[PDB]
Ligand binder design. Structure first.
Ligand SMILES: [K+]
Ligand SMILES: [Mg+2]
Ligand SMILES: [Mg+2]
Ligand SMILES: [Mg+2]
Ligand SMILES: [Mg+2]
Ligand SMILES: [Mg+2]
Ligand SMILES: [Mg+2]
Ligand SMILES: [Mg+2]
Ligand SMILES: [Mg+2]
Ligand SMILES: [Mg+2]
Ligand SMILES: [Mg+2]
Ligand SMILES: [Mg+2]
Ligand SMILES: [Mg+2]
Lengths: 83, 100, 115, 127, 99, 212, 155
RNA sequence: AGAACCUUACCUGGUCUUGACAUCCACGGAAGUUUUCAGAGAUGAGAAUGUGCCUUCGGGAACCGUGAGACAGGUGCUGCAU
RNA sequence: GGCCGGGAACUCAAAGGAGACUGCCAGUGAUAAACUGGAGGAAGGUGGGGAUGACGUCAAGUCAUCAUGGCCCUUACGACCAGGGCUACACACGUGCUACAAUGGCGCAUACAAAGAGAAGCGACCUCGCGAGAGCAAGCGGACCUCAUAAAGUGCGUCGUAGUCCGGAUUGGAGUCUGCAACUCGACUCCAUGAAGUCGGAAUCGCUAGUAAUCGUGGAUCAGAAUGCCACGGUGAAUACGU
C-alpha cells in the first residue's frame, strides 16, 4: 500500500467533482474512470459509477468502504464457471 | 517498430526534459518530512495535474536504429540484433567475440 | 498448564509450549517470557504456579485464541459482506493476493477436481 | 636465510618462507590449528614435512590469499614443497614421487551457454 | 605536487605507443617519471541472442577490454606540463591529467 | 549450417575496426548513433562513387572520417568543392569539428564491398547472375586474389523459388583466423524482390598479427 | 567405456589413521560435498565402535568389511524371451566398494538417532554377522548359488 | 535481457482526418514562457507575457499554426515469393 | 593498523618472451605411419576449457527486430487518449524453486572467496526505527570509495524422530519503498495464521572431474518488479568389467 508519509491518493477531477456534489446535494451518480482513488469520508451517501473496462458500475458508498480504492467494487473480469 | 511508437518515445523524452525540474522539487516537498501537511497535499495535487508523459518512468528504451522495445542494451543504445550486426561489421570499437 | 483457555504441553520448553496458543508465535512468546523473567529453556512443568499465574497474566494483554478467531472471522466476513475484490475471492475460494490461478492455486482451491 | 616458495591451488596463492629453526608454523598471523580448523587441511599442510622427516626442524612463515580452506591448504603444501626444493634441491625426487611438485591445474570450469552449470544440461523431454 | 596521467584504451598496442610517447616526452624535457603502472583492465561482457526469434540457447559472447595505464610525474617543471597538454595523442585513447 | 562472420571473427587478429574511438558508458550510445548517422549519409550521398569502407575516428573534440573509395576524383570533386560540403554536412550531423580524408583503393576488383556492389548493380540492371558472378570471380583471380567465393541468393532470374548459387576458385580458408579474408555483402532490390550477394576474397595469410 | 581407458584418481588417506580404505568410506558416505561432516560421522562411529568392540578401529572396520564383501554377484543377461542372472567373480576393489556402499545404505535405512549411531550399530552388526548388509550379501550369494549353472555354461 | 500506467500490437468508450511520424507549395505569426476554465484524458476556449539571430532594406534561416493534394502511415496477409 | 618512514624482494597487476614438439629413451610394427611404457618437466601426447559449424537436409523458424516482391486498408486495418486485458481458471503438460528433515532446524560466536557494477548512479559513518527503511552526509567516474561483515564450514548449546522447534503455502491486521498511480496487478518488512508434504505409479532426465551434487555472490533487462537467464567463486564425490 501507499506510504502514510505521502497521504492517501485521490484523483483531482473526482475530488473536485465530489466536493461540488457534496456542496450542491447532487444525487446523480458520479461518473468516473478513476479506480485508483482512495475513498474519503466525504463520499458517504453518494453513488459512484466507477469504470471497469466496458461500463460504469454504480457503487453506493457506505461507512465500511473508507480507505479502499474505487476499483475494488468494480470487478473487471467476468467469470461464470467453466462447465 | 511503428513510426507512431518512435514519435511517442520522442514526445515522452521531450516532455520529461521540459518538466524535469518542477516535478523534482514537487517530489522533494512531497517527501520532505518538515513540510506542512497542506503543502504536501497541494503538491500531490500539482503532481497529479502535471502531464503523465513527463514522468521519466513512462519511457521505454528503444533501439536507436529500429525502435525495438525488447532486447535493449544501455551501453550501445541498440537492440541485440543491431548490436550483433554492428559488432560483426566492426562499427563498435573494442567489441570482439569473447572466450575464456 | 492452562494458559488462556487451552492446555499448554508440559513436556516442552516454555517458548514452544507457549506458541501452542492461537495468537502467540515464537517472538510474541519470547516477549512474554522476557517480560516474565523466566528462561525460555526451562520446561513449563519445572516452574512454579506463581510463574504460571504471571505467564497467564501477561498472555492476557494479547488478544488471543477465541477472541482472535472472532476478530479474524469478522474481518473476513466484513470483506465478504462488503463485496470488494478480496471479498469475492474469499467467497469463491480463489487466491486473494494476486497469485496465479492457471496453475498452483491448490491450497485455496483444495484437492484436484477432475472434469 | 629465508628460502622462498610460491604455491598455488584453485584461486589460492601462498607465499611460504622457510627458515632453519625450531618447528613453528604461522599462517596469516595465526597458528596452523588456529587458521585451519579442518584436520585434513592440517594434514596436507604437514604432508611435505613428513616424508622428508623434518617436521620440527624448520620455522614456517606463510601468507595466503584467495580460495577456500582446502584450496589454501593445497597452495600452502605446494609452496612448502617449492621452498623445500629451494632450500635443499635433493628433495626433488622424493617430492616428485609423492606428487607435490605438480601444481594442480584443476580450475572451476566455466558456466556455459544453454547449460545450467559447467556441464549440467537442463532436463530433456522428447514430447 | 605531482602530475597523474591515466590512459584508457580499447587496444593495448596503441596505449603502449601513447605511454611510451609521453614518457619519452617527459624524459626528453627536464623531468623524470615513475614507470607506467599497468592497472587492471576492465572486461565488460555482453551476451546477445543471435536469432531474430526464439533459439535462446544460441548466443554470442562479446567483450570490451578497457586497458588502463597510470604514469606519475613527481616534479612538474614549468615546461613539461605545457608539453603534456600540447602533445597530440592517438585518436582512440583517453588521457586524463590531474594536478 | 550457419557460418560466423569472417570480419567479426578476425577483428583484433588480422582485421582492424572501422571505428577507433574511446568513450565511457555516458558517451558510447551517442557516439554509435552519430557514427551510424554519418555512415548512412555518406553511403546515400556516395552510392555512385564506389566507396568500400568508411573509417571513423573521434579524437578529442574532433571527428576524422576516412573514406576508402575506388573513385577519389569524383569523391573529392573539382578543387575539392564536394569533400568540403561533405565535411560540412558531417560536421553539422556529428555535432563537432570534422576532417575528411580520402583513401584510394588501387584494385577495386579485390575489395569485397566493391565486388558485391558491382554484382548488385548488375542484378538491378538485369544482367544474368551467372555472368556477373563469373566475371567478378575471373577478375579477382586474374588481378591477384589468392581466392574468391561469390554467393548469390534469392529468386535468381525472377524464378518463383529462391536458390543459392556460389562459385569459388582458389583457397578460401574460412577457419584460418590468420587468413586475410576480406568479406562483405550487398543487396540488390529487383522487381521480384531482394537478391543477397556475399563476397569473400582471400588475399594470403598474414604472419605476424595485428602489427602487420 | 568404448575406447578410452581410465586412469585411477589418487584419493588422500584420512588424517586420523592414514587409511585410503576409510577415505573411500567417507567419500561413499559423503553427501553434497560435505566431507568434513562425513569425516566427523565416520570418526565418531569408529570411536564408539572401537570402544564397544575392544580392538582397534582399522581391525574392527576390516573385519566388518570381510563380512559384507561379496565374492560372486549376478549380472542380468537377456537370452531370447527369458532372462538369465549369470554369476561372475568380482574384483577386490569392487568387493570393497560394494561392501562399503551396502554398509552406508543399510545404516541409512536404520532407525537410530544419529548417522554415527546408525553406522556404529551397522558395523557392530556386521562384526556380529547379522543385519541388513550381511543379509544383502547372503541374498546375492543365494541368487548366485541358485543360478550357478548359467555361469557354468557361459564359461 | 523483466505487462501496474507506459511497453501494448488486444478490448470498451471518447476523439482526429495530408494526419502521431516526413519532404514539397501558399498564407499568417519569432519561437519560447507563465496561468485560468471545462473535460477521464485526448482536446477545446481563453488571459497575460516575449518578439530573439543574419542579411539586406527586399527579405531570409529556425520554429509554430492554417489550407489543398502528391502522399504519409499499417506490429494488416503471404517465411510456401524473399 | 602496511599504520609511518621505507623497500621492489613476494603476492598481484599487464605488456613482452620462454615452455610441449612424440622433442629424448626402450620395446611392437611392414627399414613406415603410428601404438605402449619410461625419464625429464608445472603441464605428455588434442594438458583443461572456449571461440571456430563443411556440401547440404528439414519449402524448419522469423514478413512482429529490420529490409523487401506482391496483395489489402486509406474520415481506417492509420493516429491520440482514459480505463480494462495480456496476471482469467472445472482441467492437462513442460521447466524450475522449496521441502518432506537429525549428514538437520534453531540460537550465539567465528574462518576462508572469485568475478562484476556504479553519476537522473553506487551511496558509507553517525542518529532513529523490532524490521523493511528514513534523515544527515563522506568518498567514488573507481586496484583508492561504495555495493559488500559470502554461505555451506567450524566451535558450544538445544531440539530427540514428532507432521515436530520439520515445512512455509494460504489468510487477517499493521507498514516501508519506488512510481503521476501499487484495486485488478509490484517487491519487501513486522505481528499473527501454520496448508500439502514423512522421499513420490507407469515412465523418464542430467552427468566421466574440479565433473555431478550443493553453497553463497554479481551482472544485463530495469523507476520499481527473478525461483528465469548470463557469469563467479567455496566445498566436492561415486562410477566406467565392457560393447
Ligand atoms: K530465410
Ligand atoms: Mg519501463
Ligand atoms: Mg559452481
Ligand atoms: Mg496496458
Ligand atoms: Mg522457410
Ligand atoms: Mg610419460
Ligand atoms: Mg578447427
Ligand atoms: Mg514452413
Ligand atoms: Mg492505453
Ligand atoms: Mg545441532
Ligand atoms: Mg522452521
Ligand atoms: Mg570497475
Ligand atoms: Mg498429511
Amino acid at each position: 500500500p501507499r506510504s502514510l508519509k505521502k497521504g492517501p491518493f485521490i484523483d483531482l477531477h473526482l475530488l473536485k467533482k465530489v466536493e461540488k456534489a457534496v456542496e450542491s446535494g447532487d444525487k446523480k451518480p458520479l461518473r468516473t474512470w478513476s479506480r485508483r482513488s482512495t475513498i474519503f469520508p466525504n463520499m458517504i451517501g453518494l453513488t459512484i459509477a466507477v469504470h471497469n473496462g466496458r461500463q460504469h458500475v454504480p457503487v453506493f458508498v457506505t461507512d465500511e468502504m473508507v480507505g479502499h480504492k474505487l476499483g475494488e467494487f468494480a470487478p473487471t473480469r467476468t467469470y461464470r464457471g467453466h462447465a | 517498430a511503428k513510426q507512431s511508437m518512435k514519435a511517442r518515445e520522442v514526445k515522452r523524452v521531450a516532455l520529461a526534459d521540459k518538466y524535469f525540474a518542477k516535478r523534482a522539487e514537487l517530489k522533494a516537498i512531497i517527501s520532505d518530512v518538515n513540510a506542512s501537511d497542506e503543502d504536501r497535499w497541494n503538491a500531490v495535487l500539482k503532481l497529479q495535474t502535471l502531464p503523465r508523459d513527463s514522468s521519466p518512468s513512462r519511457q521505454r528504451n528503444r533501439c536507436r536504429q529500429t525502435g525495438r522495445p525488447h532486447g535493449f542494451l544501455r551501453k550501445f543504445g541498440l537492440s541485440r540484433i543491431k548490436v550483433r550486426e554492428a559488432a560483426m561489421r566492426g562499427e563498435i570499437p573494442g567489441l570482439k567475440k569473447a572466450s575464456w | 498448564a492452562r494458559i488462556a483457555g487451552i492446555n499448554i504441553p508440559d513436556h516442552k520448553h516454555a517458548v514452544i509450549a507457549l506458541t501452542s496458543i492461537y495468537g502467540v508465535g515464537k517472538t510474541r512468546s519470547k516477549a512474554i517470557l522476557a517480560a516474565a523473567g523466566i528462561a525460555e529453556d526451562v520446561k513449563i512443568s519445572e516452574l512454579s504456579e506463581g510463574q504460571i499465574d504471571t505467564l497467564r497474566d501477561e498472555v492476557a494483554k494479547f488478544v488471543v485464541e477465541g477472541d482472535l478467531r472472532r476478530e479474524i472471522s469478522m474481518s473476513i466476513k466484513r470483506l465478504m459482506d462488503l463485496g470488494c475484490y478480496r471479498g469475492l475471492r474469499h467467497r469463491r475460494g480463489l487466491p486473494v493476493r494476486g497469485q496465479r490461478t492457471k496453475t498452483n492455486a491448490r491450497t485455496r482451491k483444495g484437492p484436484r477436481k477432475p472434469i | 636465510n629465508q628460502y622462498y616458495g610460491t604455491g598455488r591451488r584453485k584461486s589460492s596463492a601462498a607465499r611460504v618462507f622457510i627458515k632453519p629453526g625450531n618447528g613453528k608454523i604461522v599462517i596469516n598471523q595465526r597458528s596452523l590449528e588456529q587458521y585451519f580448523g579442518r584436520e585434513t587441511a592440517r594434514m596436507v599442510v604437514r604432508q611435505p614435512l613428513e616424508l622428508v622427516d623434518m617436521v620440527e626442524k624448520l620455522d614456517l612463515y606463510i601468507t595466503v590469499k584467495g580460495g577456500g580452506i582446502s584450496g589454501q591448504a593445497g597452495a600452502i603444501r605446494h609452496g612448502i614443497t617449492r621452498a623445500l626444493m629451494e632450500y635443499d634441491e635433493s628433495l626433488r625426487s622424493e617430492l616428485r614421487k609423492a606428487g607435490f611438485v605438480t601444481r594442480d591445474a584443476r580450475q572451476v570450469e566455466r558456466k556455459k551457454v544453454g547449460l545450467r552449470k559447467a556441464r549440467r544440461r537442463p532436463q530433456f523431454s522428447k514430447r | 605536487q605531482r602530475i597523474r596521467i591515466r590512459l584508457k584504451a580499447f587496444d593495448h598496442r596503441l596505449i603502449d605507443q601513447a605511454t611510451a610517447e609521453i614518457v619519452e616526452t617527459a624524459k626528453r624535457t627536464g623531468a623524470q617519471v615513475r614507470g607506467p603502472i599497468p592497472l587492471p583492465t576492465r572486461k565488460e561482457r555482453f551476451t546477445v541472442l543471435i536469432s531474430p526469434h526464439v533459439n535462446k540457447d544460441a548466443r554470442d559472447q562479446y567483450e570490451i577490454r578497457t586497458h588502463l595505464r597510470l604514469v606519475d610525474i613527481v616534479e612538474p617543471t614549468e615546461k613539461t606540463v605545457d608539453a603534456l597538454m600540447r602533445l597530440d595523442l592517438a585518436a582512440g585513447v583517453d588521457v586524463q591529467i590531474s594536478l | 549450417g550457419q557460418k560466423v562472420h569472417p570480419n567479426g571473427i578476425r577483428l583484433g587478429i588480422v582485421k582492424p575496426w572501422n571505428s577507433t574511438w574511446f568513450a565511457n558508458t555516458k558517451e558510447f550510445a551517442d557516439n554509435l548513433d552519430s557514427d551510424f548517422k554519418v555512415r548512412q549519409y555518406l553511403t546515400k550521398e556516395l552510392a555512385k562513387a564506389s566507396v568500400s569502407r568508411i573509417v571513423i575516428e573521434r579524437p578529442a573534440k574532433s571527428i576524422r572520417v576516412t573514406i576508402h573509395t575506388a573513385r577519389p576524383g569524383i569523391v573529392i570533386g573539382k578543387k575539392g568543392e564536394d569533400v568540403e560540403k561533405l565535411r560540412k554536412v558531417v560536421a553539422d550531423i556529428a555535432g563537432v569539428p570534422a576532417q575528411i580524408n580520402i583513401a584510394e583503393v588501387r584494385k577495386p576488383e579485390l575489395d569485397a564491398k566493391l565486388v558485391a556492389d558491382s554484382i548488385t548493380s548488375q542484378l538491378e540492371r538485369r544482367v544474368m547472375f551467372r555472368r556477373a558472378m563469373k566475371r567478378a570471380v575471373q577478375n579477382a583471380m586474374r588481378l591477384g586474389a589468392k581466392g574468391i567465393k561469390v554467393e548469390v541468393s534469392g529468386r535468381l532470374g525472377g524464378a518463383e523459388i529462391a536458390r543459392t548459387e556460389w562459385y569459388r576458385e582458389g583457397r578460401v580458408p574460412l577457419h584460418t583466423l590468420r587468413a586475410d579474408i576480406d568479406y562483405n555483402t550487398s543487396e540488390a532490390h529487383t522487381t521480384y524482390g531482394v537478391i543477397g550477394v556475399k563476397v569473400w576474397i582471400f588475399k594470403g595469410e598474414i604472419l605476424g598479427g595485428m602489427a602487420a | 567405456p568404448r575406447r578410452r581407458v581410465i586412469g585411477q584418481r589418487k584419493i588422500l588417506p584420512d588424517p586420523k589413521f592414514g587409511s585410503e580404505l576409510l577415505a573411500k568410506f567417507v567419500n561413499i558416505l559423503m553427501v553434497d560435498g560435505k566431507k568434513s561432516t562425513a569425516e566427523s560421522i565416520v570418526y565418531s562411529a569408529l570411536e564408539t565402535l572401537a570402544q564397544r568392540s575392544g580392538k582397534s578401529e582399522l581391525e574392527a572396520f576390516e573385519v566388518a568389511l570381510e563380512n559384507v564383501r561379496p565374492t560372486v554377484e549376478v549380472k542380468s543377461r537377456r537370452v531370447g524371451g527369458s532372462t538369465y542372472q549369470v554369476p561372475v567373480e568380482v574384483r577386490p576393489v569392487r568387493r570393497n566398494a560394494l561392501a562399503m556402499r551396502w554398509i552406508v545404505e543399510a545404516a541409512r535405512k536404520r532407525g537410530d538417532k544419529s548417522m554415527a549411531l546408525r553406522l556404529a550399530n551397522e558395523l557392530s552388526d556386521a562384526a556380529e554377522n547379522k543385519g541388513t548388509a550381511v543379509k544383502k550379501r547372503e541374498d546375492v550369494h543365494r541368487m548366485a548359488e541358485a543360478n550357478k549353472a548359467f555361469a557354468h555354461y557361459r564359461w
